[PDB]
Amino acid sequence: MTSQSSVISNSCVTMERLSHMMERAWCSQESALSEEEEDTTRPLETVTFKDVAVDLTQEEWEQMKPAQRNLYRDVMLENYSNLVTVGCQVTKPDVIFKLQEEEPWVMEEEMFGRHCP
């Protein structure tokens, strides 16, 4: 019947923000004084992807509606979607084996999982 909503708040909510979390550009550069131009001899030393990936904490993911859980793994995958496509190559970290289906912390020690059909 009526209340045919001219759609306002479906899937075009993630697309529109642009100033909601990505503006989080501080420690300003007011009237800079410390400066010394020099020769470019020292190497780059890009940091890693070990620390850009976050080691999984155990007590988390309680409140955490799994629209945020599956998106958190999509943070360490879309930051990873650069480094195995274009740029310096890193290895695959240890936590990536749980980026699986059930849970990260599934029981495998202590068998006899309740015989059943």
Partner 1 sequence: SSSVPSQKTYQGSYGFRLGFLHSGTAKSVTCTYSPALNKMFCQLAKTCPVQLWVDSTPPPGTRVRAMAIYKQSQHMTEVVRRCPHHERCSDSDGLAPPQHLIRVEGNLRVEYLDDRNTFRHSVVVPYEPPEVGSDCTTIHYNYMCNSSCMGGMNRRPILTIITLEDSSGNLLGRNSFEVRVCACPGRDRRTEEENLRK
The piece of 8-16, 20-28, 77-85, 109-117 that touches partner 1 (CB under 8 A) is 109-117
Question: C-beta of 95: minimal distance to partner 1 in Å?
Answer: 8
Is 60 among the residues that bind partner 1 (CB under 8 A)? no
Is 59 among the residues that bind partner 1 (CB under 8 A)? yes
**AA letter at 50:** K
Can you tell me the distance from the alpha carbon of 92 to that of 49, in angstroms, rounded to the nearest whole number? Answer: 9
Can you tell me the distance from the alpha carbon of 116 to that of 107, in angstroms, rounded to the nearest whole number? Answer: 18
Can you tell me the distance from the alpha carbon of 64 to that of 73, in angstroms, rounded to the nearest whole number? Answer: 13
Whichever of 37 and 102 has its CB closer to partner 1, that residue is 102
Handedness of CA 13, 70, 56, 47 (dihedral sign): negative
Give the tokens for residue 82: 């650069």
Is 51 among the residues that bind partner 1 (CB under 8 A)? no
Of 35, 36, 37, 108, the one binding partner 1 by CB under 8 A? 108
Residues that bind partner 1 (CB under 8 A): 56, 58-59, 93-95, 105-112, 114-115
